[model samples]
Target: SVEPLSVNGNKIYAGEKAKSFAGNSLFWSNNGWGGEKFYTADTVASLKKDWKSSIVRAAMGVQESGGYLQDPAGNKAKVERVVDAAIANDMYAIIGWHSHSAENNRSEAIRFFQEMARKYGNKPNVIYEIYNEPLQVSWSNTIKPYAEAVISAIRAIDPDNLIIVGTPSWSQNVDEASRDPINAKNIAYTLHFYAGTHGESLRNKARQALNNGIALFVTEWGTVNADGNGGVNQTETDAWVTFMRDNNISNANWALNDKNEGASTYYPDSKNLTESGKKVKSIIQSWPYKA
Candidate 1:
């Protein structure tokens, strides 16, 4: 039911350059972490059947407490669960390394990705996001080197799944990444933004990157501010949505959890949603559907 995705000259295609995906991203895959409880098959089912989504993201935490380094088996099991469920639902799954400084743990990252690629790489549902967000650093020097190494390992096993790499300054520097992009096929750079925080200026940067010929994937974005909590800025968010629609870019919202934050789609201790959550749900449901 799902088709393999690829990048060519600044766009992603679901067998059609006009098609793109929009869906939910579950919180970090750390046990007892804020969004861990919702990382279940039932939740994925609801997102697909109830919310009208076609994708789900497993944001595997790297260096944080209770993260992959602390409990590798636990985190892997969690991520594998999401990937399996997504496949069963015929939806795309993004296995994201949700870390700010993944380069420091290069070997660990490599081994983890290799293991995943070996197991699930052949499936089209699997998309690997090697690095979540990088701090202020040289894209050409720091991030690209680390991403290339990890990508090389994955390509050896799963050569066709879309691989998204995060950029410097919390993935806001897409223009910089496009200036000297990764040398690989089916590769795309991440462009993350909280509409309340990033407006026309950030869009201009993304526009420049797109025009320069590099595919973009919004693996994580918020309708609120950059801090992950604040009032929803419909003005900028609508503009951002329009920009993505105009560019044929695929995206996933920040969270599908009940954490105590404005970006969280679920209510704490309940299944109901916050206003921001409700807004995001409607946004996703309103996305393109061939039917």
Candidate 2:
């Protein structure tokens, strides 16, 4: 059975409760969140059984590349289906924005989030990650305002829901996000991590947030290189896991692709989980899956 557990004031599902914070490139980026064919409830259940527990969070596709959220009814319905599947299998579901440029047009995302909040706000099994990593944008100038706006919009309807805000530099800078906090209860600072790209810098930032008495959540991360290209490096990944464990930080791996051909490694749907992905999975599995 799946049960919700609180970590640093955030409720998380217990056991093998995990999800592809991002997925294979299919919907938009060719890195479809684990191609549609392989993303079945059985796969999720299998992960839970193999990991000896239930998964707490799973990030499904919405709109990866730039797109309009004006008519997200179809997208929202798809996400709702995923959420229903996760709940049926006893796990938490995340409606991942999966876009780097979501901030470019705040109105569309605002409308989408508002609708999602209205529908899933009171559900403890659902979490709303405002936006994926927004690169090419400064913390104060671009990221902060977009994050606050989306957060504010969602807050209007879902006051108590767990809302995750985007951080700077691919969400690897929690320290910067702390500079402008989300004004809501049950809000957690969000960040993503890859092996390269200033791992220590991001970890230290997360530590800074924790030290400052702010809740932090590693919404997405993977063993792949920061460039989203293919390369296997276990040493770097182990070090990251060690840092997370040492700091008591929570995280979800990058993806579970059925086709195994995404922007990054670790495709669960691939004919064979790539060398890099397999190695990363080994490392992640070696750690305590739950807080």
Candidate 3:
């Protein structure tokens, strides 16, 4: 029998003020594109059970098929379902705007978050990730301004919840974002990595960001290579895990879908996991659930 976890997201950041919060939880992130299987309550609940996950990310794709831009209501509903499941399960849920060019869709991003804030702002389990990743944008001129605008919209309604802002270069420029950090309370920067693709250099960058007194959240990561396929590098993944654990940073794996990729945790329309999924599952299972 499962019940809602009683951990408060606000408190997680509260302890971060004095020092890094040692409590860490793992999350299963939905795929970049909103598909049929992973958006359901059963899927989330199953993940919590099977993977020992304490969190889940509703990665609502912005510019792809059945995405936010193409079908706002439909896409929003997909994210809402995951949010509802997470809330019902008493687990943390990250509402991620899975887009690489969020700066280009500034106005729509604001409106989308405004509605989300108004609806789920009061729920402590809900965390807003304004942008997923910015590939070729200037963090200072483009991304930061966009984040500030969306953060302001969110703060106007929900003042206390934690908001994670994405960094440039697919959320790897934590060092840069840390240099000119956002001036707000309960805000954290995102640092995403693929173990095979990113190594000590990225970890060092994250360490520098932490040293700069910037809060960091690893909202998405992969046990495989950057392309989301290949062999699972357990050694590198373990290194990253240890680094995150030392820094008291939390992370969500990418992802929970059944696509024909090395990172997909399951097969399409089936609960059975692939080899890489098994590897990630073991990792999640190994970690102690903070809540």
Candidate 4:
């Protein structure tokens, strides 16, 4: 069942102390792709029962063709499907604004999040991801400014649910944001990693972020390369698993869809899982849903 989450120092609190959660992230919610098919009740139910997921994220595509920019109503509906299912199953839902340049879409992002906070803000299962993979490597000048506006907008309506802001460089530079984090309650910076691409250096950055005393949430990560096409780096993946588990960092593995790539969990349009999917299933089950 869903528990109220809080932030203190560098950890996320679900009970009286820190807790870590594991789950899956649905691919971009754009109807133009095959990934959109997995945003269903069955998918979430199975993730909870079979994969043992306690959280699910909806990566709401923003500016791509057939994305929220072109079809806001449709995309919002798609996000609602996964969120409704997650809440029905007593799972946490992350409503992610999946965009690379949120700095340009400030007004739209603010309005959308304000609406979401007004609608789902009271639900204990709701989490707001104000920005997704921002490409700019500058945190203070660009990403931080953009996130502050959105965070203030959401926090005005929804005061308690967790809010996640992306860091610079595709949400990989947690250390940078940690140096100057958003000064608000229940706020966490996003950290991303691909076991094949991000290793010790990235972990060090993560460690620095934690030491700097800002909460972090691994909103997206993969078992493959940064491009999501290589085989799983089992050795590095194990290391990351150990790191996240040891630190009580909440995370969602990079995809629940069946795209033809190493990151995609299942075979396209099939229930059969890929090799990486099998490994991820076992990995998620290896930990307590709330640890």
Candidate 5:
């Protein structure tokens, strides 16, 4: 039997017996730091109705000018809009603290997560991503300790919600995090990549993480180059989709903007898609969501 889609983060985190859920949606960008609105309730509803996406990611820009730290109320309100829309539409939502230098802003990250936990802890549709990507930090020295602290803070309020912690080297070092996984329940490590740049090697790393019993979630990925531009590598992307589907891993595509890149799913101010958006829509439509 095809397991029905679930919004419960705890049940989704549970392995084997839990239902296999797939999330199809757009990833917001830090460019919204300038107060640009990339998503709205109408847009989310369209995604749910037209694309059959079961989830969406609200990438709250942290540490940037006019971002979460600089304008907490405004930025949080933006995220809230997406979350509200997802809840209204019966979809899962990921609250991502989109920061590359999360360690540099430790105290603020904890406080932000604490606030988010308090607000959405009881919401079954909410999932917290503590860190977006850690660039050069060592997993043991920098990333692990930071994740533990933030996890502690969030667990204090929302013990049952699923939390995703990013791995080192732009969230590709899952093997390292897996060897010394966080000692907490309902936590998963994030792995991100671009199909044109990353291929079997990254998949092998994820395979190692899985073999070592580390829960994994692909919170972000693109069909373009590592820089989020260039052509879509459908062959590599198809391979990745097959791997993720076989392993029952859920993933979200790169972005939903009109940034003139292969990663962006749409053109500006209109629901019309660019070539890349069409490709992504096709892929999303082809994938089985509710079986």
Candidate 6:
């Protein structure tokens, strides 16, 4: 049901573009400038505009295990809101499953994907992310089964929809994904990039995936860390931009949150654009999303 698109002579997909665009840092910071908050629609609007044709993959909503299991239908609404926003603006939205747990049970994971599949099936702008990077777990024991189970579940309902599966080690192990990915239809792999790590290093991982006939996406990344200090510098940013441009990969910045006011960290580069209660705007202007 899925036909892959080629990037730089390799088979990829348009869906892969969304993940590439999301690789930028988009979050609310409170400590950079004596304590300030970030994340807002205006910021997101500005980012969408700056990136132009590039896809902006924002997170839908992150929930814990018990929360999802208790009320899957209710959780769907929170995700729909974000998807509505993405579609309204002609951008892609990632229905993110940010699970931080010892391991994922197959049945539980399938149920969540089934819920999402029923809701977002066939929405061209909607992408399904099975899980955020699973940390402190072995590849086969924890992550692979969870991803495979979710992919199978989604494939049953939304055969043509794009799906992204996470890698181990905070989604840093793109090499592993390249070698072994869930072989269901319309599947694209995901990875996270940060300033602390070198950009070229990540690109090398992407390149490996490309070489192995696997499609990859950079779902989350930014210039600043939780502290809002310069974790991803200009060099790293430039390297990623170059790699994406050269490979014709898609990506997006990290986040957009108002932080509910009086936030924690604030980098001058990431100040809000207006009083619309949004992420910092000026910072986005400084580093426009180009190529």
- By TM-score, how accurate is candidate 5? 0.91
On a 0 to 100 scale, what is the lDDT of residue 96 in model 6?
A: 68
Against the true structure, what is every candidate's RMSD? 1.2, 4.7, 4.1, 1.1, 3.3, 6.4
lDDT tens digits, residue span 47-72, model 3: 67777676788777788666778788
Residues 173-238 of candidate 1 have per-residue lDDT tens digits of: 999999998889899999999988998999999999998999899999999999999899988889
Query: lDDT of all the models against the reference?
Result: 0.89, 0.59, 0.76, 0.89, 0.78, 0.54
Structural similarity to truth (TM-score) of each candidate: 0.98, 0.77, 0.89, 0.98, 0.91, 0.72
Q: Which ten residues in a row have the lowest lDDT in candidate 4?
A: 282-291
Candidate 4 Cα deviation (angstroms), residue 262: 0.8
Q: What is the per-residue lDDT of model 4 for residues 118-166, given as tens digits with 9 covering 90 to 100?
A: 9899998999998888786699999888888888888889988999999
Better of 3 and 5 by lDDT: 5
Residue 32 in candidate 3 has what lDDT? 45
Candidate 4 residue spans exceeding 4 A from truth: none
Give the residue spans of candidate 6 off by over 4 A: 1-11, 15-75, 225-228, 258-291
Model 5 clash tally? 0
Candidate 4 to truth, TM: 0.98
lDDT of 1 at 181: 86
**Tens digits of per-residue lDDT for model 5, 27-104:** 543444322466588877877788777678888888777677878887788788888888888777889999998889
Deviating ranges (above 4 Å) for candidate 2:
1-34, 52-71, 258-271, 283-291
lDDT of 6 by residue, 84-192 (tens): 6555666666666656552545576677678768877866666777776777666666777777767777878888777777787787777776776555676777767
**Candidate 3: clashing pairs of residues:** none
- Ranking of all predicted structures according to lDDT, beginning with the best and ending with the worst: 1, 4, 5, 3, 2, 6
- Give candidate 6's whole-model lDDT: 0.54
Ten residues in a row with the worst lDDT in model 1? 10-19
What lDDT would candidate 1 get against the real structure? 0.89
Better of 4 and 6 by lDDT: 4
